[PDB]
Amino acid sequence: KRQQRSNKPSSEYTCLGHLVNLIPGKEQKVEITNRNVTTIGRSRSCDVILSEPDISTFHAEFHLLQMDVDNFQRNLINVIDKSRNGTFINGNRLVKKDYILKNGDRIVFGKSCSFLFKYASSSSTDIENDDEKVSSESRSY
Length: 141
Fold this sequence. Notes:
The chain has about 140 residues and is mostly beta strands. The protein has one domain (about 1-130): Sandwich (Tumour Suppressor Smad4), CATH 2.60.200.20. It is about 0% helix and about 45% strand. The protein is built from no helices and eleven strands. It has strands at about 15-25, 25-35, 40, 50, 60-70, 70-80, 85-90, 90-95, 100, 105-110, 115-120. The strands form two sheets. It has a six-stranded antiparallel beta sheet with strand order 2-1-11-10-7-8, with no helix packed on it. A five-stranded mixed beta sheet has the order 4-3-5-6-9, with no helix packed on it. About 15% of the residues are buried.
């Protein structure tokens, strides 16, 4: 069948994980797909577009691969440096070109943009009173 239920992806591959940016005054969450290669920079084409006036377009690239072992699928991210703007991972400067990134990892790009990466297989957030307006209709209520 060509027609499927629910919403289907068009530009975004498949949601797997997300990146939370730590900013003094607010936070930002970005969804990451399993495109094998994630781009970070000013270019809109990049997987993750930072928020810097002089953010490197080719700043850095992250490899997102998904594999199935035993039964549960595990994801692994690799940190690679190919720019001259300044990239600090895990609070330390990268020396090699094959760093392994895992859940709860802090990454800094440009010496200002810092975000934490984690896997979002299911993500539980069942509360009672969420702080956010949610509507289904328009021009009403």
